[PDB]
């Protein structure tokens, strides 16, 4: 018999992004080919199967720095990190291949699906 | 020119609640009249003006335990903590006064608004 506030989840995510932009309570640095991205472990886990696996590991959960595979493109990661905190994906002809590869590695199934669909439309 | 994934914010919040239910990466205990509630500081800040003020304070941001005012009802707090992580508010005739008072103290403006409206309808 609960009532539901429609905009609550969107408002929470908007506030989490405001905390990220001001570097408030960020507890991890993600290193991608020498580029560094600060974020909240909980948000990374909530969006990515890879980060979920990493931060539920009894040893890795305590790491303040995570280094991604050197094949990962920093721009592709930046676009996906922005998507995690906003629901908005900056998908362009010039970045779609790097974004899909990064989403496959991060295990972000819905992003992989839209990239596959957009690539299939261009062929 | 971004595309947007409609269910992303809801899916993030659902995963954050799964982390809370399994006590994964919770970093604070909220004490309410001897009852203890584990939560994520970032989610508390994202939902409440009071927690936002507390955890942006240079000294309080480092506290692992926060004690609420003794007038705060533990059931009212539990209902609001559930709302924070789910967007669902268990508002009932028997709890509406305790829920409104707790939401006013926590500075959760949208909850205060619906409680005022539901109380006004009953008079």
């Amino acid at each position: 018999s609960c009532i539901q506030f429609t905009r609550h989840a969107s408002d929470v995510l908007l506030n989490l992004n405001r905390l990220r932009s001001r570097d408030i309570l960020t507890d991890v640095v993600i290193v991608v080919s020498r580029e560094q991205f600060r974020a909240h472990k909980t948000v990374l886990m909530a969006c990515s199967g890879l980060f979920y696996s990493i931060f539920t590991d009894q040893l890795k959960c305590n790491l303040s720095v995570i280094n991604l595979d050197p094949e990962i493109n920093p721009e592709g990661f930046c676009i996906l990190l922005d998507f995690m905190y906003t629901s908005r994906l900056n998908l362009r002809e010039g970045n779609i291949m790097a974004v899909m590869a990064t989403a496959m590695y991060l295990q972000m199934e819905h992003v992989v699906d839209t990239c596959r669909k957009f690539i299939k439309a261009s062929e | 020119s971004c595309i947007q994934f409609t269910r992303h914010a809801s899916d993030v919040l659902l995963n954050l609640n799964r982390l809370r239910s399994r006590d994964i990466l919770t970093d604070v205990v909220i004490v309410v009249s001897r009852e203890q509630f584990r939560a994520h500081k970032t989610v508390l800040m994202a939902c409440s003006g009071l927690f936002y003020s507390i955890f942006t304070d240079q000294l309080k941001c480092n506290l692992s335990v926060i004690n609420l005012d003794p007038e705060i009802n533990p059931e009212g707090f539990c209902i609001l903590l559930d709302f924070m992580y789910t967007s669902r508010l268990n508002l009932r005739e028997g709890n509406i006064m305790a829920v409104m008072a707790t939401a006013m103290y926590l500075q959760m403006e949208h909850v205060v608004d619906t409680c005022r409206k539901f109380i006004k309808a009953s008079e």
């Binding site: 009532i3 539901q4 | 669902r88």
Partner: peptide, 4 residues
């Protein structure tokens, strides 16, 4: 607010 809605009835979910």
């Amino acid at each position: 607010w809605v009835i979910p």
